[PDB]
Design a protein around this ligand. Structure first.
Ligand SMILES: COc1cccc(S(=O)(=O)N(Cc2cccs2)C[C@@H](O)[C@H](Cc2ccccc2)NC(=O)c2ccc(O)c(O)c2)c1
Lengths: 99, 99
């Protein structure tokens, strides 16, 4: 599909038994999701943006479905105000910028 | 052009006769540039990101040529980690997300 940018490019994502709305975010290197208690190993990390840094937990090889497209990769979990689908997963679902 | 996302979507922009690199950011409502001088009246504004809120200067009706495509609109100047072209200008140049 083609998504115009008049409004925020929010799409439905699925991670486990949780459906969430997330931003398709070409400015984000990484995928950052709102606080959630995922199983398995993780590592602490800091990530920086407008306003400064937040602390997140890095989980690896997490399957995530984005508009019915399968992805699997690193997901950062922490107190983000918005769920963010970054370039690590945008590539896996075939997402490009066009103009 | 068609731009893939294995690398950061950084492009050359032209603003006030100066060349800068800016990130095409679908996760940005607005266009935010690092500290620089722009002509004309500006208004104080506050914007929120992942790490909280920052103060910016809002300049209206600023021409920017983005990868050869002309935009004229609002530019915020302030402590963004990287120059970002946001949706206000991405829409002007006909930029969409596709997968
Ligand atoms: C390794 O670090 C990161 C990994 C993943 C995401 C981010 S990010 O969210 O801070 N951000 C990176 C930025 C690049 C330039 C400025 S911030 C991605 C942006 O697209 C970010 C998404 C976002 C986050 C929180 C709330 C809204 C949007 N955009 C902005 O912070 C932003 C852009 C324009 C605005 O006018 C504004 O108020 C906020 C950082």
């Amino acid at each position: 599909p083609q998504i115009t940018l008049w409004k925020r490019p929010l799409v439905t994502i699925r991670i486990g038994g949780q459906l969430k709305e997330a931003l398709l975010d070409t400015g984000a290197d990484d995928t950052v999701l709102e606080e959630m208690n995922l199983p398995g190993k993780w590592k602490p990390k800091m990530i920086g943006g407008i306003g400064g840094f937040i602390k997140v937990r890095q989980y690896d090889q997490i399957p995530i479905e984005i508009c019915g497209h399968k992805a699997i990769g690193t997901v950062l979990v922490g107190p983000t105000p918005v769920n963010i689908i970054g370039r690590n997963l945008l590539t896996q679902i075939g997402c490009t910028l066009n103009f």
